[PDB]
Subunit: 131 residues, 2 copies
C-alpha cells in the first residue's frame, strides 16, 4: 500500500539518526537528532506527512510511539499505527564531510538516486498512480 | 520546468524560516533555522536534493548563495543557479502549537494538502510524468 512508512532510530558516533522508509518503494528520508525523544519523532512525522500522503507508520520499537507528543502529531496529521546499508553508504562518504549530518544526507541522496528505476523514481511513480 | 525550485528565508518571532517552493506545482517545504547562514542553506539544499530531482534553484536574495558551503553542496548534488500566505496559515494555527517550528510544519501540511488537485498531488504528478 502507498501510504505505509517505517520509522526507526539508529545510533552512530554518539548521535541519533531517524530513518523513515517508504515500504513499497525503498525511498528514505533521514535526520540526525540530538536525542531519541518523543518531541523529535513528532516533529519528524509532521514534516513527513506534509510532504507525502502518510496513512500508516510502522516501527521496530513500539515504545517509540508512546509519548503524548507523538500521539498528538499522528492525531492531527491523520496517521494511524536499509538501516544497515545506509550505514555502509555513510561509511564510504564519511571523510568527505565534517559533520555526520551532512554525510547522512549524502547517503540518503545516493540511496534514493541509485538505479539497481531508482527509489526516488519509484516513490513518485507509486504515489502519482494512486492519485 | 520540473527541476526548478525557489529558496528564500522569512523572519518571524526572532526566528528564521527557510522556504523552498517547487515553482511549477506550488509545493513547499520549510524549516525553522536559528541563523540565516550558508551552512544551514547548504544542509537544507542537500536534504531537498536527495528527495526530489533538483536541477536549478532561484532565490530573491542572490547573496544567499555565495558561501563556500552552499557552492560545495550545489556542486556535489549537481544543482545549478507563498511567503506571505504561509505566514497567514501560520497565524491561524499558531495557538495550537507551543513552538513556532511545529506551527510552520502544520502550515506546510495545510498548504500542500489544500485543493483549490493539491500542490502535493501536482508535484508528484509533474515529476512522475517527467520520468
Ligand atoms: Mg527504533
Ligand atoms: Mg531570502
Amino acid at each position: 500500500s502507498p501510504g505505509i512508512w517505517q520509522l526507526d532510530c539508529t545510533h552512530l558516533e554518539g548521535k541519533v539518526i531517524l530513518v523513515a522508509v517508504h515500504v513499497a518503494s525503498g525511498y528514505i528520508e533521514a535526520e540526525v537528532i540530538p536525542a531519541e525523544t518523543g518531541q523529535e519523532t513528532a516533529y519528524f512525522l509532521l514534516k513527513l506527512a506534509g510532504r507525502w500522503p502518510v496513512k500508516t507508520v510502522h516501527t521496530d520499537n513500539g515504545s517509540n510511539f508512546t509519548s503524548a507528543a507523538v500521539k498528538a502529531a499522528c492525531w492531527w496529521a491523520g496517521i494511524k499505527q536499509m538501516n544497515k546499508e545506509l550505514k555502509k553508504i555513510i561509511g564510504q562518504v564519511r571523510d568527505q564531510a565534517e559533520h555526520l549530518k551532512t554525510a547522512v544526507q549524502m547517503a540518503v541522496f545516493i540511496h534514493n538516486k541509485k538505479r539497481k528505476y531508482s527509489a526516488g523514481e519509484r516513490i513518485v511513480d507509486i504515489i502519482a498512480t494512486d492519485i
